[PDB]
Design a protein around this nucleic acid. Structure first.
Lengths: 180, 141, 30, 82, 129, 218, 56
RNA sequence: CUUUAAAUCCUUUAACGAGGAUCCAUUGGAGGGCAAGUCUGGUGCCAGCAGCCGCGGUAAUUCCAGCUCCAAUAGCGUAUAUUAAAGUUGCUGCAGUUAAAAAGCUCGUAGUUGGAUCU
């Protein structure tokens, strides 16, 4: 007996066919266009979208006045609208099945700091996030996979201690100034 | 045809259970004769002592000498023949030294043009054959 | 070298699979 | 044919056999669409009108196109009762 | 010998409709056959039918309008709950847009949609589409 | 330049047939691939499914021909499959493209569930058969994609099916029978009588009757 | 049938030293380079759709 | 500093810390299945590769290497058990003329299944 917990799950699934040329092309397109590190990030987003589709499909089989369908579908649609993936006017379970993987990849903190103009590119965005140059609201966020919420979208700054934000120019600038 | 009655569950279940024994893989797994006959005895790997170096002739369409070793397993004292996979790797094996042998990849079936050989050497003298082949390690002295 | 020609000649040889792959590359994709 | 917004979403609406009420396929090249001329009530001449009958290839193959066209013409007033 | 007169009736209707015939004869008639036929007809799948009354067991002459793809029986009459109805629909019906599964429930013989409306289950008699 | 040989070709060349659906409605045979080139020639994409060598033994050696299986179709409801055997691979492919154009059939698309938007899947479950290969197409929810083997997937994507479940039985290793069976299953979509197709059919003048004098003066 | 020749070809293969080359990019940069090579560069293409390691 | 029973680890602060940023990514592959070289050198049915088909008997697209390429990536290969693939155990849902298969033929208890009909 221990006071520990052993709850853990995988956040991705590897594809059944390892060398499907079309799938390789689409996954590489996504990686390059969103500045991802590997295929596992694509598969992670694919898996969360797939589980959302599974939940929506399970709920759509139910009666339209089932309290469980109403409650859980409303919760799922609310969670989708809150993260900015689903439009607030498209608040029906059938619009969940129309969602695409690029809708979730557009809400990443990396994509958002590239779109907001804080970075010259998407790879610059990733290296800027991992280097503690970006804060969300008041909190410094280190994780490029941080899914930015709609209310949190408008507060993404350069952090109050970064050379690009507040003061204290970095180690290289200080060394250069000292050397002359 | 087959029976379709609401009270045929015993008939269907029993017929399926009897007919599953004509499945070769099911019978091999559930009869217990194959596990008894298996030199590894259900293990994935086994450690053994090299008795001699034996050269195995490749089957008729091909032509080569497959450099194998006869080994005696420590667990049960059974004598098997194990392929030494890569080239020059028979020079890494001496006589009367301990080798780790695994299956050859067909779950107890011979692989390729190597008759009656279903095992391959993985380690020799507690050093992997891959490390010795690539020069990453040397056999102990 | 035209892969259609290479497939026509060498499809039944040791390089039949390779010429088939090259022919399929040329036939569809551009 | 239709969706929730009400518009018709099919590419086209295929014909149905006038005898069997089965869809006539795009590649049913044995199916026919025969027009039988209407005849003026008093002079017995072609008045420019006709009645159309589509018969599928299967019905023609089983030999029943003749009786089916006869039945349709009789039910259409073209062929005299009795 | 013949069991399941409804199976015979449904197979006869299916075989006649596949030959493109306008009427089909069904013998023997029964209450279950008449109710299944009424369910088929209320959805426009067969048309009018006549019950010939002989003093032993009636016959039915069913007018066929060629809108029927398959009418079939499900033997045995598995008990179906309201949860299992979706799985049965997926198994049997060609689409979620059309096709019906006929059940015998304590509220009568009805299609699966009507059984969902009355919140009842029962035993599966057959299907038609 | 195209010189039509058939009545249908002459009617099509002179802009008397306004759509390919008018040809399908009357189920007229299309004996000229230039008709399809006229109607859809900007959106059709042909894919060589396979080149398969076939050998006939003779007095001295095997005479070898090459059979091209080619799938064609715009991705919006039209698809065809053509097989041509010839001495040279290039002419076999040319003939197979011609034959796939000639065999283009319409594809009926439906909805899995609620009917919002354009049709995305097969209207119902449809089975096609060719030489012990049975291919079953099942409606799928929107966004599923084609859950199938690569060979039927090519033809289903070319037919404008966005999402569909697939079952297959038999020797699907024979690519020709697999492709022909899925083409049959696709072409059976418009032959299936669904209750929305119960409305009585309003008969129209056939192209040969409507534009008769045009052909008479020719 | 003798074990005298057991490392023949590997023993008699002339030894060639590996050449020194700059390090390969790793992680996101390697994927960026692959994406750029396959979807932003078109000059290597000539219409034949040749492979990426073609030698003829 | 903080943490903690006391520590450690995270977190926080300061100092030093990157150019071949040498502060160097690997594991398996490149005939097909299956993504990616009938490029070069060696070997010459040998050595070996090869899950399978197959490769090697003097241009080896397959072995041993160099180069190049691709697959996943702080991971990747191998053995074995097992699941899906297997509608190759089939209740859903398989077969049984000729591919494996219907008892030589009847009777027959259990088992299974049983015609219409009562508002």
């Amino acid at each position: 007996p221990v006071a520990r917990s052993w709850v853990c799950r995988k956040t991705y699934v590897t594809p059944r066919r390892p060398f499907e040329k079309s799938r390789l092309d689409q996954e590489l397109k996504l990686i390059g266009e969103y500045g991802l590190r590997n295929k596992r990030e694509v598969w992670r987003v694919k898996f969360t979208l797939a589980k959302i589709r599974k939940a929506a499909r399970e709920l759509l089989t139910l009666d339209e006045k089932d309290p469980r369908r109403l409650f859980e579908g409303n919760a799922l649609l609310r969670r989708l609208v809150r993260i900015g993936v689903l439009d607030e006017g498209k608040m029906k379970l059938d619009y969940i099945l129309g969602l695409k993987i690029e809708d979730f990849l557009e809400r990443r903190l990396q994509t958002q700091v590239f779109k907001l103009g804080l970075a010259k590119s998407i790879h610059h965005a990733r290296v800027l996030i991992r280097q503690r140059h970006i804060r969300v609201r008041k909190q410094v966020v280190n994780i490029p996979s941080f899914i930015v919420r709609l209310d949190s979208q408008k507060h993404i700054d350069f952090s109050l201690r970064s050379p690009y934000g507040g003061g204290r120019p970095g180690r290289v600038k200080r060394k250069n100034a000292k050397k002359g | 045809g087959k029976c379709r009655g609401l009270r045929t569950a015993r008939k269907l279940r029993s017929h399926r259970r009897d007919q599953k024994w004509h499945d070769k893989q099911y019978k091999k797994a559930h009869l217990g004769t194959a596990l008894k006959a298996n030199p590894f005895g259900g293990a994935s790997h086994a450690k053994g002592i090299v008795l001699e170096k034996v050269g195995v002739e490749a089957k008729q369409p091909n032509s080569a000498i497959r450099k194998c070793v006869r080994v005696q397993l420590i667990k049960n004292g059974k004598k098997i023949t194990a392929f030494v996979p890569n080239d020059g790797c028979l020079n890494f094996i001496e006589e009367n030294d301990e080798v780790l042998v695994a299956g050859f990849g067909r779950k107890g079936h011979a692989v390729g043009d190597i008759p009656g050989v279903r095992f391959k050497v993985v380690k020799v003298a507690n050093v992997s054959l891959l490390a010795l082949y690539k020069g990453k390690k040397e056999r102990p002295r | 070298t035209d892969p259609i020609d290479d497939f026509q000649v060498n499809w039944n040889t040791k390089h039949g699979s390779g010429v088939t792959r090259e022919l399929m590359r040329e036939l569809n994709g551009g | 044919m239709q969706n929730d917004a009400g518009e018709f979403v099919d590419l086209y609406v295929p014909r149905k056999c006038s005898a069997s009420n089965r869809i006539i396929g795009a590649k049913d090249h044995a199916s026919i669409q025969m027009n039988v001329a209407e005849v003026d009530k008093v002079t017995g001449r072609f008045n420019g009108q006709f009645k159309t009958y589509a018969i599928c290839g299967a019905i023609r193959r089983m030999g029943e196109s003749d009786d089916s066209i006869l039945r349709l013409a009789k039910a259409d007033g073209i062929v005299s009762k009795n | 010998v013949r069991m399941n007169v409804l199976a015979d009736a449904l197979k006869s209707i299916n075989n006649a409709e596949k030959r493109g015939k306008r009427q089909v004869l069904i013998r023997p008639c029964s209450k279950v056959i008449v109710r299944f036929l009424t369910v088929m007809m209320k959805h426009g799948y067969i048309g009018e039918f006549e019950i010939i009354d002989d003093h032993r067991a009636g016959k039915i002459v069913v007018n066929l309008t060629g809108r029927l793809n398959k009418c079939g029986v499900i033997s045995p009459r598995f008990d179906v709950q309201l949860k299992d109805l979706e799985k049965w629909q997926n198994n049997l019906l060609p689409s979620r847009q059309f096709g019906f599964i006929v059940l015998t429930t304590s509220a009568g013989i009805m299609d699966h949609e009507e059984a969902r409306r009355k919140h009842t289950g029962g035993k599966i008699l057959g299907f038609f589409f | 330049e195209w010189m039509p040989v058939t009545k249908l070709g002459r009617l099509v060349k002179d802009m008397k047939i306004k759509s390919l659906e008018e040809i399908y409605l009357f189920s007229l045979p299309i004996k000229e691939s230039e008709i399809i080139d006229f109607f859809l020639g900007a959106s059709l994409k042909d894919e060589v499914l396979k080149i398969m060598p076939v050998q006939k033994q003779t007095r001295a050696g095997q005479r070898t021909r090459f059979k091209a299986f080619v799938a064609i179709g715009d991705y919006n409801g039209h698809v065809g499959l053509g097989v041509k055997c010839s001495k040279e691979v290039a002419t076999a492919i040319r003939g197979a493209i011609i034959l796939a154009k000639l065999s283009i059939v319409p594809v009926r698309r439906g909805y899995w569930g609620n009917k919002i938007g354009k049709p995305h899947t097969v209207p119902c479950k449809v089975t096609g058969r060719c030489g012990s290969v049975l291919v079953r197409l099942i409606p799928a929810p929107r966004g599923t994609g084609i859950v199938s083997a690569p060979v039927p997937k090519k033809l289903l994507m070319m037919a404008g099916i966005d999402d569909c479940y697939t079952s297959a039985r038999g020797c699907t290793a024979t690519l020709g029978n697999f492709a022909k069976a899925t083409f049959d299953a696709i072409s059976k979509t418009y032959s299936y009588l669904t209750p929305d197709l119960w409305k009585e059919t309003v008969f129209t003048k056939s192209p040969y009757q409507e534009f008769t004098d045009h052909l008479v003066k020719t | 049938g003798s074990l005298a020749r057991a490392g023949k070809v590997r023993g008699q293969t002339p030894k060639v030293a590996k050449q020194e080359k700059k390090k390969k990019k790793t992680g996101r940069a390697k994927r960026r380079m692959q994406y750029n090579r396959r979807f932003v560069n078109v000059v290597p293409t000539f219409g034949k759709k040749k492979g990426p390691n073609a030698n003829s």
